[PDB]
Amino acid sequence: TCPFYKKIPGTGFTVDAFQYGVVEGCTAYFLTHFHSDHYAGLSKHFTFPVYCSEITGNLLKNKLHVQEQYIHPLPLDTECIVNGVKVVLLDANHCPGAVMILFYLPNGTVILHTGDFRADPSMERSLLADQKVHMLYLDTTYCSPEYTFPSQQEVIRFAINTAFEAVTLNPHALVVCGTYSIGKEKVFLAIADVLGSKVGMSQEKYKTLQCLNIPEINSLITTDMCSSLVHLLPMMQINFKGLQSHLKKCGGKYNQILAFRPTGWTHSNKFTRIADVIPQTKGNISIYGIPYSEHSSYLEMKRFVQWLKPQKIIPTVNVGTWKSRSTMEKYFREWKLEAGY
Ligand SMILES: NC(=O)c1ccccc1Nc1ccc(Cl)cc1
Ligand code: NI
User: Fold this and answer.
1) Which of 70, 105, 178, 222 could be bridged to 235 by S-S, CB 3.0 to 4.6 A?
2) Do both 286 and 152 map to the same domain?
C-alpha cells in the first residue's frame, strides 16, 4: 500500500513509489534521484512511464535495464507539460541527477516536492522566487538542532590537505575512498586532482560514473588500478581487515594506506570540530570518517522553510514514529511563530 506522503493530490502522479505494485489511478511515476530506497521496485520489467532527470534516466537504462520507451527525461529549470499538468524540475543539491519537483495543479494549488536535498541560499533565486507554494513535501532527515556539520567546501579542504601531506611525506602511501551509491564524488575527485592521479575503480563503478555527465570524466577515472594512487572500494571494505587484504593485492607497490569513509552526521559532530578530526590507526593503516553531508543541516532546512513560507508541510523522512512526528511538528510551529507568519 502506497503511503499518502508519496501521492500528489488532484493528479495522476506519485513520487518515488515503485515498491507497491500497480498504484491505483497513477498515470505517471516520478523518480527524484537514483538512490535505492527511492527506486526500490524498479527493474528491467517495469511497463509504466517514468519521469526524471537526464542523469537519472541514464542510470535507469544502463544500471537497472529499464526499456528506453518507458524513460521520460526532462530538462531542468524548464516549464514542461506532463499528462496535462505543468511541472518544473529543479536541482536538489543532493547526488548527481537529483531533483526537486514543482507541480502547478489545475485548481491553482502549487506543490513543491524536495525529494532528498541539501538546502542552499542559491535556491532562493531559482524559479521558486516567483510564486507562492501551498504544500511542501520536505526532506526532514536531520530535522533536529543537534544535527550540525560543516560546509562541503570545509570538508573537502580537510581531505585534500590530509591526503597531500601524507603522500608527500611517504610517496609509497596509497589513498582509498569508500563508496556504496552515487553521491559525494567530490571527495575522491578532489583528492586525486591534488595528487596528480586518475581515480582507479572496478568495472561496475566505472560504468556508474560514466552515466553522470561529469565534464572531462575520461581524463579523471580509470579501471587500471596499477596506474592510479587513489582507489575506490566498497564502503563495507573500509576497515582494518579489508584494507590489509587490499594492500596485499597491490604487489609491493605500496607500504601504507590512508582511507576515507564519507558518512553523514555522526555523534562526534557534537564534540569535535572538522580541523580537530583524527583517524583510527592500526600499524600502517589509518581511517578517517569525514562528515560530508548531501542532506540539509537543521539550520539550512529552517532557513529554507522560513524563506518559502508554505501553507502546509508534509514530512517525507522520520515519519515512522510518533516521537519523531511530534518533534518535527513542534519545530515547524517554532519556525512559523519566529517568522511572524
Ligand atoms: N505541518 C505544518 O504545516 C505546520 C504545523 C504546525 C505549525 C506550522 C506548520 N507549518 C509551517 C511552519 C513554518 C512556516 Cl514558515 C510555514 C508553515
Ligand atoms: Ni538520497
Assistant:
1) 178
2) yes
